[PDB]
Ligand binder design. Structure first.
Ligand SMILES: *[C@@H]1O[C@H](CO)[C@@H](O[C@@H]2O[C@H](CO)[C@@H](O[C@H]3O[C@H](CO)[C@@H](O)[C@H](O[C@@H]4O[C@H](CO)[C@@H](O)[C@H](O)[C@@H]4O)[C@@H]3O)[C@H](O)[C@H]2NC(C)=O)[C@H](O)[C@H]1NC(C)=O
Ligand SMILES: *[C@@H]1O[C@H](CO)[C@@H](O[C@@H]2O[C@H](CO)[C@@H](O)[C@H](O)[C@H]2NC(C)=O)[C@H](O)[C@H]1NC(C)=O
Ligand SMILES: *[C@@H]1O[C@H](CO)[C@@H](O[C@@H]2O[C@H](CO)[C@@H](O)[C@H](O)[C@H]2NC(C)=O)[C@H](O)[C@H]1NC(C)=O
Ligand SMILES: *[C@@H]1O[C@H](CO)[C@@H](O[C@@H]2O[C@H](CO)[C@@H](O)[C@H](O)[C@H]2NC(C)=O)[C@H](O)[C@H]1NC(C)=O
Ligand SMILES: *[C@@H]1O[C@H](CO)[C@@H](O[C@H]2O[C@H](CO)[C@@H](O)[C@H](O)[C@H]2NC(C)=O)[C@H](O)[C@H]1NC(C)=O
Ligand SMILES: CN1[C@@H](CC(=O)c2ccccc2)CCC[C@H]1C[C@H](O)c1ccccc1
Ligand SMILES: CN1[C@@H](CC(=O)c2ccccc2)CCC[C@H]1C[C@H](O)c1ccccc1
Ligand SMILES: CN1[C@@H](CC(=O)c2ccccc2)CCC[C@H]1C[C@H](O)c1ccccc1
Ligand SMILES: CN1[C@@H](CC(=O)c2ccccc2)CCC[C@H]1C[C@H](O)c1ccccc1
Ligand SMILES: CN1[C@@H](CC(=O)c2ccccc2)CCC[C@H]1C[C@H](O)c1ccccc1
Ligand SMILES: Cc1cccc(NC(=O)N2CCCC2)c1
Lengths: 205, 205, 205, 205, 205
C-alpha cells in the first residue's frame, strides 16, 4: 500500500543521480545489449544509416536496495531515470541525437538491480555503398561510456537479439555480430571499454 | 474559488506522482480507448504509417479523492498531468515520439477517477504495401505498460470507435479491430498486458 | 518601478495558476476571436491547411486586481503567461502543435482584466480539394476548452476582421464566418461551447 | 573571481526580471539595430523570406548598478538573459519562431547598462515577386514591443550596418533603410513605437 | 561512491555556474581544438556547409579543486555541464543551432582542471562553389567567446587532429589549418580572441 510511497521517500534520501554508484574500488558492472528492430533508411550520398533499436542496460546500484520485510509486497519499483544514476553510454559514430521512443523509466528490485530498456531511433555514419550488392553494407554501431573508464564502469555484453527485426522491411538483415573491446587512449591514464554491434544488410532484390 | 485553491493544496500534500496508486493486493484498472482520426500519410518505401488518433485513458487514483461536503461546489478539477501519476503506456511499434496536440490536462472527480484524453500524431512501423489494393493495408497499433505488469496495472479495452474518422481523407477506413493480450516475456514471471488496434485501409478510387 | 515591484509581491501571494478563477456559481467568461494573417500552404494529398493567425483572448481574473491608489501610476502590467491561469483552449482539428510567434506575455489591468494576444502558426485537417475552383475550399477552425464546460468557462466571441489578411498571398478569401455554438458530448452532463472560424478561399488566377 | 561572485548574490536580491525598470515619468530607453548577415532563401510561392541577422539591443536597468569601489576589478559581468528583464521585442510579420544562434548572455556594466547582441535566423512574410527583376524585391522587417507603449519603453534606432552581409550569397543586397515610427491603436490611449528595416535585394545574374 | 557523494556536496556550495572562475587579475585560459569527423552536405545554392565535428575544450576552475587525501580514490569526477561554468564560445558564421550529439558531461580532476569534449553537428555559411574543382572549396569555422574579452577569457589552440575524418565520404579532405586572432570591435577597449579553423575539400570522383 503506502509502503511504496514510504520507500520512494527513503530511496531519494541522500541520493545523487550524477554520481556513479561505485562501491569501494569495485567498478559498477553494466550489462549491455542491442536488438535491431528496423533499418528505416540509407543515404548513399551522405553515408548515413537510420535505425530503430531497443537497448538493454542493466547494472546494480547498491544505494537503491531495501529490506523487503520493511516494505511488505514491494519487490520492485518503477522510477524515472532523471531521479537515478544511469550509464552515460554514447554511440561513438552517431550523426544525430538519439530519439528515445519509450517512457524514460527504469525498473529496480529490492537488491538494487536496475533495468533501463529504451527503444531508440538514431542515425549513424556508415559506408552504405554496398547496400546494393550480394555482400551488402556493413555498419558498426559503436557504444561506450563518454566519461567513465573501465575501473569505474565495467561495460560487458549480453547476447544480442535479431528475433525482433521486422520482416516486411525493404532491407534484408544478413547478420549481426557484437564484440567488446578495450583500449588505452592518448589522453587518459585509465583504459576505456566499448561494445560494437556490426550489422550487415542489403536491399531485397 | 477558495475551495478549489484549498483542494489543490491538499491533493499535492504527501503526493508522489512517481508512485502507481495501487492499493493492497489490487491492481490499478486503466480503461483504454483509441479513436482513429486521420491517416496523414503512408511511406511505402520505409513501411511507415502516419496517424492522428484520440486516446482515452481513465483510472482511479485513490490518493486523489476528497469529501465533497468539505469542498462544497467542487465536483471535479482540471489538473496538469505532470502533477499526477499517469499510466506509462508505450506504443510498441512506434518509430517516432508522440506529438501531443491538445492541452496536457486531466479531469479528476471527487472519488479520484482520472480521465486523460490526449489527441496525438504519431508514426508507426507498418507493412503498407497493400494500400492500393481492394483488401487494403493492415497496420497494428500496439500499446502497453512499459514497466508495470498485470498484477499492478490492469489494461482494459473500451469499445472500438471509428466515428471520428474524417470523411475526406484519400484513405478509406475499411475496419478497425482490437484485442487484449496478456503476454509473458523470457525475463519475468508476471505477464504484461497489451492492447492492439488493427486498422485496415486502402487508397480511395 | 518600485510600485510595480511591490505589486508583483502582493499578487503572487497564494496565486495558483492551475486553478480556474471562478467565483461561486459564476463561470469565468472568456472572450475569443481569430484573425487570419496568412494561408501558408495547402496539402492537397494529405488534406491539410497551414495557417498563420492572431488570437485575441481576454477574461477577468479576480485574484489579479488592485487599488490603483495603492500603486500610483500602475494601470496595467506585463505578465508571463506561465505565471497565470490561462484558458485551456484547444484547436479541435489541428494536426500539429501550435507554434507561438510572439512573446508569451499577457496584459493585466487593475480590475483583473487579462488580455493575451498571441500570433500563432498551426496546421489543420481540412478538405482543400476545391482550392482551385471558383467556389474554393472551406476550412473550419474549431476552438473550445479541453476540460472546462459551460458553467465554468463561458466562451464568447468578439467580432471578426479580415483586414490583417496579407494581400500579396496566392490565396484569395471568398468567405469568412465565426459563430459560437454550444453542444453536448457523449461524456458529460454539461454542454461545452466552441467558436468556429470558417474560411473559404481559393487560388488566384 | 571572489568579488564577481559577491556581486551576483547582491544583484539577485530583490531583483525581478518580470518588471520593466521604468521610473516615474521615465520610460526605459531601448536602443535597437539590425545587421543583415545573409538571405538564406526566398519562397516565391508562399511569399516568405528566410534571413540570418544580428540584433543589437541596449538599455539601462538601474537595479543592476553597483559601486566598482565595493567590487574592485569588476567593471562588467556576463549574465544569462533569463536572469534579467529584457525588452519584449516582437517581429510583427514573422511566420516562424526566431532561432537564436548565439549564447543567450547579456553584458552588464556597473552603471546598469545592458547589452544583448543575439544572432538570429527567422522567416518573414514578404512579397518576393520582384526578386528576379532589376527593381528587386522589397521586404520589411518590423520590430516593436509587444506589450509596452512609448511611455514605458522608448524604442530608438541606432545607426545600422551591412558591412557584415556575406559577399558570396546568390542574392545581391541592394539597399537597406530604417525608420522609427510611433503609431496608435483603437485599443490604447498610448502609442506603440516600432523600428522597421526595409531591405531590397535581387537574384544575381 | 560515498566519498564522491560527499565531494559533490562540497563543490556545489557557493558555486555559481554563471561566474567565470577568474583569480585576481588572472584570466581563465581555455584550450580549444576542433576535429573534423564528417562533411555531411554542401548547399551550392544557399552557400551552406553541414558538418559533424569533435570539440576539445579545457580550462582550470580553481573553485573545483580538492585534496585527494581528503577524498581517497577520487581522482576525477564526471559532472553535468549545466552544473558548472563553461566558456560561452560562439560559432560566428553558423546558420543553425548546434546539435550536441554526446552526453553533456564534463570531466574534472582534483586540481580543478575541466575537460569538455562534445561531438556536434552544425551548419555554417560558406562559399562552397569551389567544391567541384581541383582547388576545391574553402570554409572557415570561426569560434570565440561571445561575452568575455582577452583579459577575462584567454582562448588558446591545441593541434587540430584530422585523424578522425571518415574515409568513405564523397568529399576529400585537402587541408585543415587553425589560427588565433584578436579583433577590436567599435565598442570596447579590450580585444576579443577568436580561433578559426579553415578546411579545404573537394568532391571525389
Ligand atoms: C467518478 O467517476 C467514476 C467513473 O465514472 C464514477 O464511477 C462509477 O461509479 C458508478 C456508480 O457508483 C459505478 O457503478 C457500479 O458498480 C457496480 C458495477 O461494477 C454495480 O453494482 C453498480 O450498480 C449499482 O447497482 C444498482 C442496481 O442496478 C444500480 O442501479 C445503482 O446505480 C448502483 O450504483 C454500479 O453500476 C461504476 O462502476 C463506476 N465506474 C468506475 C470505472 O469505477 C464515480 O462514481 C465518480 N465519482 C463521483 C463522486 O461522482
Ligand atoms: C534482482 O534482480 C537481479 C538481476 O536480475 C536478480 O538476479 C539474478 O538471478 C538469477 C536467478 O537466480 C541468477 O542466476 C543471477 O545470478 C542474478 N543476476 C545478477 C546480476 O545478480 C535477483 O534475483 C533480484 N533480486 C531479488 C531481491 O529478487
Ligand atoms: C556603461 O555603458 C554605457 C554604454 O556604453 C556607457 O555610456 C556611454 O559612455 C560613453 C563614454 O564613456 C559615452 O560617450 C556614451 O554616450 C555613453 N553611451 C550611452 C548609451 O549612454 C557608460 O559610460 C558605461 N558605464 C560605465 C560605468 O563606464
Ligand atoms: C589535471 O589535469 C591537467 C590537464 O591534464 C593536468 O595538467 C598537466 O600535467 C601534464 C604533466 O603532468 C602536462 O603535460 C600538462 O601540460 C599539464 N597541464 C597544465 C600545464 O595545466 C594536471 O596534472 C591534472 N591534475 C592532477 C591532480 O592530476
Ligand atoms: C480593465 O480592462 C477592462 C477591459 O478593457 C475594462 O472593462 C470593462 O469596462 C469597459 C467599459 O467601461 C468595457 O469596454 C469592457 O468590455 C468591460 N469588460 C468587462 C469584462 O467588464 C476595465 O474598465 C478596466 N479596468 C480599469 C480599472 O481600467
Ligand atoms: C571521449 N573519448 C575519451 C576521452 C578523450 O578522448 C579525452 C579525454 C581527456 C582529454 C582529451 C581527450 C573517453 C572515452 C570515449 C572517447 C571517444 C573518442 O575520443 C571519440 C571522440 C569523438 C568522436 C567519437 C569518439
Ligand atoms: C520491455 N518489455 C517488458 C520488459 C522486458 O522485456 C524485460 C524485462 C527485464 C529484463 C529483460 C527484458 C515489459 C513490457 C514491454 C516489453 C517490450 C518488448 O521487450 C519490446 C521491446 C522493444 C520493441 C518491442 C517490444
Ligand atoms: C475533449 N472533449 C470534451 C471532454 C470529453 O470528451 C470527456 C470528458 C470527460 C470524460 C470523457 C471525455 C470537452 C470538449 C472537447 C471535447 C473534444 C472532442 O471530443 C474531440 C475529441 C478528439 C478530437 C477532437 C475533438
Ligand atoms: C499587440 N499590438 C498592440 C496591442 C493591441 O493591438 C491590442 C491591445 C489590446 C486589445 C486589442 C489589441 C501592442 C503593440 C503591438 C501590436 C501588434 C499588432 O496588433 C499585430 C498583431 C498581429 C500581427 C501583427 C501585428
Ligand atoms: C559581439 N561582438 C563583440 C561586441 C560588439 O561587437 C559590440 C559590443 C557593444 C556594442 C556594440 C558592439 C564581442 C565579441 C563578439 C563580437 C561578434 C560580432 O559583433 C559578430 C556579430 C554577429 C555576427 C558575427 C560577428
Ligand atoms: C508589476 C508586475 C510585473 C510583472 C508581473 C507581475 N505579476 C505576476 O507575475 N504574477 C504572477 C502570479 C500572479 C501575479 C507584476
Amino acid at each position: 500500500g503506502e509502503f511504496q510511497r514510504k520507500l520512494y521517500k527513503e530511496l531519494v534520501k541522500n541520493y545523487n543521480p550524477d554520481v556513479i554508484p561505485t562501491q569501494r574500488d569495485r567498478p559498477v558492472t553494466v550489462y549491455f545489449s542491442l536488438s535491431l528492430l528496423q533499418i528505416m533508411d540509407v543515404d548513399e550520398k551522405n553515408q548515413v544509416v537510420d535505425v530503430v533499436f531497443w537497448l538493454q542496460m542493466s547494472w546494480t546500484d547498491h544505494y537503491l536496495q531495501w529490506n523487503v520485510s520493511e516494505y511488505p509486497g514491494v519487490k520492485q519499483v518503477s522510477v524515472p531515470i532523471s531521479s537515478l544514476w544511469v550509464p552515460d553510454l554514447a554511440a561513438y559514430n552517431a550523426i544525430s541525437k538519439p530519439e528515445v521512443l519509450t517512457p524514460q523509466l527504469a525498473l529496480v528490485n529490492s537488491s538494487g538491480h536496475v533495468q533501463y530498456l529504451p527503444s531508440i531511433r538514431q542515425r549513424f555514419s556508415c559506408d552504405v555503398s554496398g547496400v546494393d550488392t550480394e555482400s551488402g553494407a556493413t555498419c558498426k554501431l559503436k557504444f561506450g561510456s563518454w566519461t567513465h573508464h573501465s575501473r569505474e564502469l565495467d561495460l560487458q555484453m549480453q547476447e544480442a537479439d535479431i528475433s525482433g527485426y521486422i520482416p516486411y522491411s525493404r532491407f534484408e538483415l544478413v547478420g549481426v555480430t557484437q564484440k567488446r573491446s578495450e583500449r588505452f587512449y592518448e589522453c587518459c591514464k585509465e583504459p576505456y571499454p566499448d561494445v560494437t554491434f556490426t550489422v550487415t544488410f542489403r536491399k531485397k532484390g
